[PDB]
Amino acid sequence: VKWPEYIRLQRRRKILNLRLKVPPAIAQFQKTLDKNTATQVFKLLNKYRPETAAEKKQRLVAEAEAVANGKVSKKPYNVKYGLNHVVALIEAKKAKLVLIASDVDPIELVVFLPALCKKMGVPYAIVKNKARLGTVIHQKTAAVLAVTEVREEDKNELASIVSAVDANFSAKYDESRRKWGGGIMGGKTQALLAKRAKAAAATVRL
Amino acid sequence: DSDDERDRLEADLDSMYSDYTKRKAESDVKYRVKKARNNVEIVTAEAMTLAQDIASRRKSKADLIDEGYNRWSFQSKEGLPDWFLDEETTVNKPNKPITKEAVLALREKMKALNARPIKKVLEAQGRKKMRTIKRLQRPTLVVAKGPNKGLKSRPKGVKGKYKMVDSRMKKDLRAQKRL
Amino acid sequence: GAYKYLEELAKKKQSDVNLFLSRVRAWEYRQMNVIHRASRPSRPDKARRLGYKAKQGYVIYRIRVRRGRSARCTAEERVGRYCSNLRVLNSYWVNQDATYKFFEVILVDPSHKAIRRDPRINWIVNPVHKHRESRGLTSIGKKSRGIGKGHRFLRHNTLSLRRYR
Amino acid sequence: YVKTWFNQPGRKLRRRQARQTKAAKIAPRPVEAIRPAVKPPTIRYNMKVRAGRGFTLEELKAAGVSRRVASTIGIPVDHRRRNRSEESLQRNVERIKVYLAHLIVFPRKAGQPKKG
Amino acid sequence: ALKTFELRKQSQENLAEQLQELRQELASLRVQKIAGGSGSKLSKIKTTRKDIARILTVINESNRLAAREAYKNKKYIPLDLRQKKTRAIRRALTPYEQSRKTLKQIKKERYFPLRKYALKA
Amino acid sequence: KSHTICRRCGKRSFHIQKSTCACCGYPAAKTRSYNWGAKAKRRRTTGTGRMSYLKKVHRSFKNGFRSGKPA
Amino acid sequence: KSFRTKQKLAKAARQNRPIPQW
RNA sequence: UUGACCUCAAAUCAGGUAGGACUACGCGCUGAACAAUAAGCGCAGGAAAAGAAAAUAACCAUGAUUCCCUCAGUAACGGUGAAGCGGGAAAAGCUCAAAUUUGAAAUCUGGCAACAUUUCUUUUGUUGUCCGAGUUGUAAUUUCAA
RNA sequence: AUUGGAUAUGCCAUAUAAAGCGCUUUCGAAGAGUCGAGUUGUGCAGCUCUAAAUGGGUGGUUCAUCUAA
RNA sequence: GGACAUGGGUUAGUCGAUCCUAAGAGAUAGGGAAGCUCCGUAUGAAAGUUGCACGAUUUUUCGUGCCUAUCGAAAGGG
RNA sequence: CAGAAGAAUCAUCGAAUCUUUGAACGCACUGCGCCUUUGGGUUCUACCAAAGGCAUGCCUGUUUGAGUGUCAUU
Ligand SMILES: [Zn+2]
């Protein structure tokens, strides 16, 4: 078998990130929110999607016609997105729930967010894929989402989601996110490495 | 299974690399012939410069230990796969300074007992000497007159080192003698 | 803003996070070619402050140059030759190991309309900015030739004879 | 390498033409801006008074000019220079105040839509 | 010699037929010269050659103007129809692109433009 | 024979064995120029040929590189 | 002998041509 | 199973762009024997480079750059050889990154379609619409003089 | 003919807009394998090590000045 | 006169070249190098000119199976 | 000289033509190909000709894909 170079790079990077010792700030992203709660998170998030580019123009031209003939509204409620915008919201202590993508490509973009969210007192969760967050906000990718205000109808729903994240993500893991990650080896890998280690330690010290 | 799919990926990565290193070595004629047929051994000059410093007390042992906490010591190699380590040593290897004294000491260690015996010091010296011996055994005045007047290069019927005279340089010759 | 956290996080280049990522990315960059396209900057904070905007016409190219002339100056000159239809805006440092120093070079397409219609990058479309990297007019090129204001940094041997002297 | 000055008369006339070309572009207004008065920085020269670069932000403010309209009416601004003594401040305030009294400012054309 | 304005008032098929008959006339006159001609025949060689050029010019001009009509108000037109000043001029910033300013610089010139003033001596 | 006609510069300086002209440097893209050969440059520089296009650019500059037809 | 050398030899033999008398 | 995204490819894919010449002046690199020189190499323009102080000075202070005169064969270094001040030429200032637009990505390329426009059927845009780029950040706002 | 910046004048103008100045019981982000230290070459570069926040640079007898990457 | 002048003269489906390969050279992949450039020739290349075949057309959005440079000879091969 | 009778070996110049090469670009250095379309002749599944195409690096976009890369999906 002869894999292409880019396919070989992909799979080696997968194994390499496992064998190495991942620091606690980077290993906490290996432990994401469970599948049930993530579904409930995105149910609430999909009631606050920002309006589409067509739907916004549809609304604006509707109001433009009214003034063109002859002529006050409510504050829009939606989900907050954008790394700089969300980080500014967390430092402002305005965010109620921060949802960090688990595979942001340069990981240091989000590596401080769990600590910043815990410093400011914001309930946060790490959810799977940057594309699920992107889907909510009509983008291809969202490194992080945040909820600051919801309608009075969904105040009780958000209070249930926040408790579930607290019970299933923060109360859980917790100590597991303070431990260096990695070093995971296959079923037969330690035995092979033990033979290699004892052979090397015998006389192969140069 | 997440674990089982992980385990077979490591096996495939390991096995394909071993195939690559095998067929890469097969290009060597000597390697093919070779296949057809706790301690430590200081053999690297880098280690010898270090070993000399510890023994000679020039560099304090406590300072050496502190100098060992650097960017490279914290890049641990415990358990990494061969396809990763092999390139890491080839590329990510810190190049420590090298002293001539360790170079001499390594040459002394590498000096075998029969490296320079009586024959290899006498006939080997003899063959070079006799070779050099076989290697070792292995102006005309022209007057610028007649057809030789106004020449620019080697004239007709003149070979080897030669000198040209025109009877006008006689005046300069006498003046030079008087000088 | 997250660009403050990235700036202060890139200051500690041997901490646990920054040392783990340095090796992982250094091996990754070694698998690829010596000069390969970078889809996005690995340091969005540093590229941003060096002139890079995340729009069409801005290009990032990653290059590794052997250690042991400035390595950064070599990085821009090798990339600019490789991508000859672009202009070398600036460059920065991303990673390094015992053999290589890794750089990312920000280039700009002078034939793109998003560049030619941008009043803040129009200056690079004029022909006098042809190969800034080659003439020592980049940030590292200026430094390598001592261009600066202070005392730290043909009128001598010429004889100036006036009409009435 | 010998430098010659055979184009010294040619250079002098070219600059006089360049001054003339400036006046063609901008006729009712002077071909030079108004420079301030400053004192040279040495014990050898501090008795004298020469022309500086621009009027400090305090000299403009004391005179009554803002730093935005100063360049429009031809008054250079020097953000670097400062007034360490009242003597330098009062000297350059009157240099501007004489300038403003001797200045004619032609009105521009202001666009104004149908409604407000 | 055929008058060019008369040629421009005719159709291409008529022009092609005249070109064919002019080429036959030129071929015969060349044959007569190499077989022994006279003063009149040698004078007719250059006149016919210049007339063939006139026919080809008119046909080519009509073809190009037909192409320009088709590509009028198109974003992309054939290269030989585009401008050719110099390679550098074609690559320079257009006057619209050059004159583009930021909103910051637009507000500066709108509120603080360079005034017209005068100093009383 | 040790030299043949170079296709680029038309001089009988194309070395048979090295496949390289000694006058211009063909097949290299850049022509062979050497400042110590000051007379060598003036023998084959601009102006030693038809210079047909450059004369057209020189003539078209005065009117502003205009196009179109008159009235 | 290619076309090229045939034309080169022809022009070489056309250079040493007697001058026209007019 | 179906689908999102990341990365990487392919096309005689839609539209572009690079090369070579000249090289007096200009900017880099390299560099001898006897000179930031010649040669060699790279890269531009009608000028290039420099340029709005991590600058001088020790004054009653000066105020981007460039060039000229002067400083001055002076100080310093040990024959080499400046610079601050001073006189003059010309003068013009500024743009970003780092701020949450968050009561609304307000930003932009391209296709198609009309409409104008032209040194010009050759140029350059506008208006509409659609697909995309973009939240891993495009506009407005701010650049410490604030 | 082809053009430039003005002047006069017509039409249009998305001003629910934009700006200067002045006031503050409210705030004010400032560029890192960079500076620097050590060493080896010719301020600059390589190598090793590698920062700070009234911090840092450069001058002068604590002060002055400046605000790099 | 092999000089000069003026004209004329070389006709191929079967003769040679054209095609193939030889030692070697050589671009491409990648890697060096401040650099003019050098190493490298199936090398850790996604290396297929319409690689090939199959199918009542497959949720009228393609599924299944198979196999996996060029130059260099007017005396070599044809 | 002959010959011809808006002339001209005229000027200007804004429209065109511009063979083979050359940065030289289908591959080679007398040649050898491929792709699209059109045309001919005692004459048509053959042969021939003509026109328009086919270099490389890179940028923006488009379409088509690959991945035991990251996931979602009662
Ligand atoms: Zn040649």
PDB file of C-alpha atoms and ligand atoms in Angstrom, chain F residues 6-11 13-14 21-26, ligand 1:
ATOM      1  CA  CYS F   6      23.707  29.944 -33.015  1.00  0.00           C
ATOM      2  CA  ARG F   7      19.985  30.195 -33.718  1.00  0.00           C
ATOM      3  CA  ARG F   8      19.517  33.225 -31.451  1.00  0.00           C
ATOM      4  CA  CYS F   9      22.286  35.617 -32.519  1.00  0.00           C
ATOM      5  CA  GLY F  10      23.092  34.038 -35.898  1.00  0.00           C
ATOM      6  CA  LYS F  11      26.831  33.924 -35.191  1.00  0.00           C
ATOM      7  CA  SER F  13      29.763  30.686 -32.030  1.00  0.00           C
ATOM      8  CA  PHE F  14      27.444  27.868 -30.882  1.00  0.00           C
ATOM      9  CA  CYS F  21      26.844  29.992 -27.766  1.00  0.00           C
ATOM     10  CA  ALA F  22      29.942  31.961 -26.795  1.00  0.00           C
ATOM     11  CA  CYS F  23      28.502  35.278 -28.036  1.00  0.00           C
ATOM     12  CA  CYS F  24      25.027  35.538 -26.483  1.00  0.00           C
ATOM     13  CA  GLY F  25      24.787  32.552 -24.131  1.00  0.00           C
ATOM     14  CA  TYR F  26      22.034  30.618 -25.909  1.00  0.00           C
TER      15      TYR F  26
HETATM   16 ZN    ZN L   1      24.370  33.098 -29.915  1.00  0.00          ZN
END
